[PDB]
């Protein structure tokens, strides 16, 4: 089977099991894949999304340790373009409208997340040790 | 080069960059390695060490996503024995006295940790947004 290039992007702030399973899912979309992960910049995240706890460098260094991640684009563009797909020979974008053009092209693969496994939820747990 | 079996054990509660780099270091002790990671049980951790935020299942499921981890023993024995090394064909124990017999046998490889990269330190950071 030829090698399929998959691109997933995100903030990956305080990486948890939810992110990890999402990356695993992207990586296992096809038998033979290269999973490329894009990591959004601090400024663009803050402008468009919200506060980020970890720097770009911290968020990227953590992702490097994840089994499913084959390549990292850091920082990545905030918006995926057709030129970007051509530049990196990407076959599919994996994510969970703005991806409408990707779907029309047949280049979108949906991926889900899991809840209750997040970093902020662990603090509640430490806290729930006190009435 | 023959394949060297490395064993590292730990709690791996709320896995962070510090743990990840330690595993990477164990995994790269030799050119060709199998890194086996042992994950301590909830009861024994609590008895001998302190509180654990995440269950054995949660701590093991996270470790599964780490690139450097080749095999997981979960739960693992709290104390490493010579019989345990023989059972799993282990060549070296990688850790940071109680490992004295391991050193005498030539079966101990030291590994370090990093600080300021921990999960609890990230909460200070979110908090330090308020006087």
TrEMBL record, chains A, B:
Biological classification of the source: Eukaryota, Sar, Alveolata, Apicomplexa, Aconoidasida
Annotated positions binding phosphocholine: 11, 49
The Cytidyltransferase-like domain, residue ranges: 7-123
Protein name per the record: choline-phosphate cytidylyltransferase
Assigned protein family: Belongs to the cytidylyltransferase family.
UniProt-annotated binding residues for CMP: 11-12, 19, 96, 114
Lineage top rank: taxon: Eukaryota
